[PDB]
């Protein structure tokens, strides 16, 4: 099929600064490219079509340039509304396809993950069940690593992440990771550990707590 | 006021089939393609196939031949996807969209149906405290875990509580059960003189729990 | 308004290519197919192929397939139809027309363009001579008299004919063109007026010929 | 691939009838066709789509049905300006039209007569133009005398389409004279035999 390529998943950016979201084709698809724009929970938006065109009600910021494979929409005076994915299309032929997406975000200076580990409840426990959760709180930027060790012994397919949006005033992330273990496997070991990666860490950070 | 309206929510069970409506309005029906897109994750678009009402005609993506079949109703203005043989995979957020121009591109886009497809009835969740650890700032928060559908609401001391609050994503368990976790930093003088009451909402099964979270 | 306009009339030898243009105004270009259909003269309605102005993709007749062209230029929401090795049978007049149709099968053709007639033949092109039909001069007091201007030996077609620059609509009656034994076309415009207007109002027509970009004002009067 | 045949070829009806023409597809079609007004000088006009649909901004008395492979065309109510050629289509292929005149009450010609200009004689050639204004059935003769001798060869007519107002023809005959011929006579005529006349009309003039 014709491949619509979005190099970067996601692009940093500041409000009032330029941005360009690229876009290649994998085959000549003249000027039949489109670009839509989503925010979480709503539809896809069209703002430019047919490469350069822009939709009816969409302000003079967005401008779109490219024929042929090399496509690109451009944000003159990033807006908060505009922090959002953007998506290519091309419209050149069966089947249609749409590029990966490209989050818009907001940069800002390196913040360390501060990082808490939390041991199951008692109530928990009563049910047969042991959740040890870690949290890693208002880091920057998002990429982050979480090895769960128990006895000093890695772990791995045992536990489930989850992310935040970026923060509305802090510009930052937070990451929940939940080591999910039987009671009668957390009963059988000592120490719990939660090591924390983060660009902004020099060294790995490790949290744990002695089960009792 | 041209509108793709689409049904809300549908929760399936593998192995059987939905039918997804999508009512159209404010244009002529049948001079307009319409074309069906699947996402998970709020992630991204995957093209499923478009069907031309006037002509009846239907184009597939390959990988939703024998998946997915369209077809239009001219005297009710409705677009139909039914998806066969439900799997896990199956999942998703279903769009429906129409057409801009004959050329191609897609100007207006109904609001989307989330499709579930999992072996499990509404549960209720099982609210269980994070604690804060042993001045500075402390952690604490609330762990809802093995509940059925999604969503839940989370809040703090009845919303008198939000700055610092972190309510994360739930993530789907192998036993087809949600499990959410709700955390807010506070001072650590906070602890023992003010009380923190994580407040869970499962409307799906009409739970109301309250928990108060104790170092 | 939604309309399409072509290029002017033009003469080709044989064996050369010609190129029509078509601008599109009053709807966005890139979002229709454009279609090409020609016309012999006297026969009926041939076509030729179309263009997708948004991917560029093309779908000739068979019977053209390796002898035309189509093609666009979105900036100037502007498609071509080029056809080569042109041969008597070729002269007609080429149409633009673009597919209104959403559907995948069905075809509206809406709007056409006005036409633009290519005639195939080693002939030259030349200039009318415009010469006055003046008033019997007879005529009858209380009635209605007849003028008209001669527009003569002139090759290829066509000729436009206004009279009073479009003010003299009424009664108007440009003839269709005759074929001289020399090659050259010759027809006649005239007009019936009231016997009261040849000694206050003026007339004069307006020939335009242009294949040989002529153009004659000329005044008629007894 | 499709073969499109219409019926009737040509037909002449009167202001205000109701005219009906067919089409026939050579295989099955549903109702994907479509029917194109072209009247002489312009392009052709979309009036009817998907067998049935009228097109926005084309008046009410024009219609259409059938699917399958037989299909009609009609105006209701014949009206001065529908004098043209009606073609169905499918997709690429066309029919061969259908001509609509109108049959209207005879009209006697307006004859009119102009001698060549004096332009014209320095070129050496005498064109001599003869009017038949507005007439109606079509059928007319045109005789030009030369000197009261009958003329023959040297003569060139041409005929208007029925008139979309009041549905007439007007014809005009040019002499083409050696303007050494020209010079060596005097007595120039053009005589019109009409049905709506009661005797033939002549018109000349002199020098
Ligand atoms: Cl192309
Ligand atoms: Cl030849
Ligand atoms: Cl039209
Ligand atoms: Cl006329
Ligand atoms: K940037
Ligand atoms: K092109
Ligand atoms: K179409
Ligand atoms: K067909
Ligand atoms: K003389």
């Known amino acids: 099929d014709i491949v619509m390529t979005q190099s970067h998943k996601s692009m940093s950016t500041s409000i009032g600064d330029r941005v360009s979201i690229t876009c290649k084709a994998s085959?000549?698809?003249?000027?039949?490219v489109a670009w839509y724009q989503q925010n979480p929970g709503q539809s896809p938006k069209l703002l430019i079509f047919?490469?350069?065109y822009r939709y009816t009600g969409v302000p003079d910021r967005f401008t779109g340039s490219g024929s042929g494979t090399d496509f690109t929409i451009t944000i003159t005076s990033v807006q908060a509304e505009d922090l959002a994915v953007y998506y290519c299309?091309?419209?050149?032929?069966?089947?249609?396809?749409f590029g990966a997406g490209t989050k818009l975000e907001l940069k800002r200076t390196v913040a360390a993950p501060s990082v808490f580990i939390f041991p199951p409840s008692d109530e928990q426990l009563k049910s047969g069940t042991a959740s040890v959760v870690c949290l890693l709180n208002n880091f920057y930027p998002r990429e982050a690593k979480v090895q769960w060790k128990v006895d000093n012994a890695l772990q791995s397919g045992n536990s489930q992440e989850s992310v935040t949006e970026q923060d509305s005033k802090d510009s930052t992330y937070s990451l929940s990771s939940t080591l999910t273990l039987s009671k009668a496997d957390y009963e059988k070991h000592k120490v719990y550990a939660c090591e924390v990666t983060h660009q902004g860490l020099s060294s790995p950070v490790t949290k744990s707590f002695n089960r009792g | 006021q041209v509108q793709l309206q689409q049904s809300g929510a549908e929760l399936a069970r593998p192995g059987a089939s939905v039918k997804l409506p999508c009512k159209a309005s404010?244009?002529?029906?049948?001079?307009?393609?319409l074309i069906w897109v699947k996402q998970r994750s709020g992630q991204g678009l995957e093209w499923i196939g478009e069907?031309?009402?006037?002509?009846?005609?239907?184009y597939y993506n390959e990988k939703f031949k024998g998946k997915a079949t369209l077809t239009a109703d001219k005297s009710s203005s409705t677009a139909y996807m039914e998806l066969r043989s439900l799997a896990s995979e199956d999942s998703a957020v279903y769009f429906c969209?129409?057409?801009?121009?004959?050329?191609?591109?897609?100007?207006?886009w109904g609001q989307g149906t989330t499709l579930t497809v999992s072996s499990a009835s509404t549960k209720g969740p099982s609210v269980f405290p994070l604690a804060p650890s042993s001045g500075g700032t402390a952690a604490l928060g609330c762990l809802v875990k093995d509940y059925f559908p999604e969503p839940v609401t989370v809040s703090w001391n009845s919303g008198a509580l939000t700055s610092g609050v972190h309510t994360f994503p739930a993530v789907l368990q192998s036993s087809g059960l949600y499990s959410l976790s709700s955390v807010v930093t506070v001072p650590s003088s906070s602890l023992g003189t003010q009380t923190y009451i994580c407040n869970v909402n499962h409307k799906p099964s009409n739970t109301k729990v309250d928990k108060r979270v104790e170092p | 308004?939604?309309?399409?306009?072509?290029?002017?009339?033009?003469?080709?030898?044989?064996?050369?290519?010609?190129?029509?243009?078509?601008?599109?105004?009053?709807?966005?270009?890139?979002?229709?197919?454009?279609?090409?259909?020609?016309?012999?003269?006297?026969?009926?309605?041939?076509?030729?192929?179309?263009?997708?102005?948004?991917?560029?993709?093309?779908?000739?007749?068979?019977?053209?397939?390796?002898?035309?062209?189509?093609?666009?230029?979105?900036?100037?929401?502007?498609?071509?139809?080029?056809?080569?090795?042109?041969?008597?049978?070729?002269?007609?007049?080429?149409?633009?027309?673009?597919?209104?149709?959403?559907?995948?099968?069905?075809?509206?053709?809406?709007?056409?363009?006005?036409?633009?007639?290519?005639?195939?033949?080693?002939?030259?092109?030349?200039?009318?001579?415009?010469?006055?039909?003046?008033?019997?001069?007879?005529?009858?007091?209380?009635?209605?008299?007849?003028?008209?201007?001669?527009?003569?030996?002139?090759?290829?077609?066509?000729?436009?004919?206004?009279?009073?620059?479009?003010?003299?609509?009424?009664?108007?009656?440009?003839?269709?063109?005759?074929?001289?034994?020399?090659?050259?076309?010759?027809?006649?415009?005239?007009?019936?007026?009231?016997?009261?207007?040849?000694?206050?109002?003026?007339?004069?027509?307006?020939?335009?010929?242009?294949?040989?970009?002529?153009?004659?004002?000329?005044?008629?009067?007894? | 691939?499709?073969?499109?045949?219409?019926?009737?070829?040509?037909?002449?009806?009167?202001?205000?009838?109701?005219?009906?023409?067919?089409?026939?597809?050579?295989?099955?079609?549903?109702?994907?066709?479509?029917?194109?007004?072209?009247?002489?000088?312009?392009?052709?006009?979309?009036?009817?789509?998907?067998?049935?649909?009228?097109?926005?901004?084309?008046?009410?008395?024009?219609?259409?049905?059938?699917?399958?492979?037989?299909?009609?065309?009609?105006?209701?109510?014949?009206?001065?300006?529908?004098?043209?050629?009606?073609?169905?289509?499918?997709?690429?292929?066309?029919?061969?039209?259908?001509?609509?005149?109108?049959?209207?009450?005879?009209?006697?010609?307006?004859?009119?007569?102009?001698?060549?200009?004096?332009?014209?004689?320095?070129?050496?050639?005498?064109?001599?133009?003869?009017?038949?204004?507005?007439?109606?059935?079509?059928?007319?003769?045109?005789?030009?005398?030369?000197?009261?001798?009958?003329?023959?060869?040297?003569?060139?007519?041409?005929?208007?389409?029925?008139?979309?107002?009041?549905?007439?023809?007007?014809?005009?005959?040019?002499?083409?004279?050696?303007?050494?011929?020209?010079?060596?006579?005097?007595?120039?005529?053009?005589?019109?035999?009409?049905?709506?006349?009661?005797?033939?009309?002549?018109?000349?003039?002199?020098?």
């Open positions: 069907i031309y009402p006037r002509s009846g005609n239907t």
């Open positions: 047919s490469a350069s």
């Open positions: 085959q000549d698809v003249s000027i039949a």
């Open positions: 299309q091309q419209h050149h032929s069966n089947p249609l396809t």
């Open positions: 969209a129409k057409k801009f121009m004959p050329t191609g591109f897609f100007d207006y």
């Open positions: 404010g244009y002529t029906f049948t001079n307009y393609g």
